[PDB]
Scaffold this active site. Sequence first.
Site, PDB file in Angstrom:
ATOM      1  N   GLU A 154      57.142  48.754  67.470  1.00  0.00           N
ATOM      2  CA  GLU A 154      58.346  48.541  66.637  1.00  0.00           C
ATOM      3  C   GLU A 154      58.834  47.087  66.729  1.00  0.00           C
ATOM      4  OE1 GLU A 154      61.189  51.776  67.444  1.00  0.00           O
ATOM      5  OE2 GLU A 154      59.742  53.271  66.741  1.00  0.00           O
ATOM      6  N   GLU A 254      54.404  57.132  65.445  1.00  0.00           N
ATOM      7  CA  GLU A 254      55.417  58.105  65.818  1.00  0.00           C
ATOM      8  C   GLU A 254      55.959  58.701  64.539  1.00  0.00           C
ATOM      9  OE1 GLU A 254      58.665  56.600  68.125  1.00  0.00           O
ATOM     10  OE2 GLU A 254      57.360  55.347  69.416  1.00  0.00           O
TER      11      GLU A 254
END
Length: 310
Positions: A154, A254
Amino acid sequence: VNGNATEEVKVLLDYIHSLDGKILAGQHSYNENPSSFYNKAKEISGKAPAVWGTDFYWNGKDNPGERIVKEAIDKYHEGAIVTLMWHVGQPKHDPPFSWRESVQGEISKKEWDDMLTPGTELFQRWTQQVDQVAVHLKKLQEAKVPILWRPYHEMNGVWFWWGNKKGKDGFVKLWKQLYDRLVNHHRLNNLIWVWNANGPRDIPGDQAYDYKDFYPGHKYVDILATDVYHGDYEQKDYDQLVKLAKGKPIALGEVGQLPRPLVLEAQPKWSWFMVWSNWIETANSPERVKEVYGYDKTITKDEIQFTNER
């Protein structure tokens, strides 16, 4: 990307390259109980996930690495594909790393620059934190376990200390420094390098910027992945990642809400998904879990077949 890759990495990468529309079912668990939500996914769906994931995050008193390694070897021995990530605090801090004050803490430009400069205190401290994980990756190599390795994930987001670091002296230099330490210093050849971003968004206080601004180049990345919560499987975001990947596999690193079959039909290049711990229950009805696990293109553990074993 590693010319010295072990045979199990080459076999797994060939398998992932061959999926051509199929998608591996995956599930993440916190390292305190590193199979608890993997086991829950199996209870809900009736099938064990193909991909088993946990996290080196040292958030408690003890180093979690030995517990993670023992369960990763067991899961690999059971036939699962292993993925590992690494929430970590800043070089200036020691474990256990506070979520709010370290992992998501502020870091100055000078502190960032120093961590990427051999000879400084922060570079030395960064090497020691890397080595506390490398020792466990090396035990996994000795057990011949290939790892879908997703560090500093991220990174296009603003929330982690390693996030939103643009330019040639930003994130891409951290990625290459970690790559050099793990592959060249530690001779870790069992890693598949997964560059795992976040879906982009321009929400005040919560932005995630363009994928390409944080991509270190094809020489350093095996697979590109992104994190998609709230069912936000935007076609444009898929198109952006496919464009950047230029033939490398992509994956849903994810997810919360699972991708429905219609999404997977429209977005066939996703190679796996990994549900985040108890989102398997809180973001998905049991019927939805069973619909996705039962979809003809979804591969669970019992269905993994390497072409050399046929």
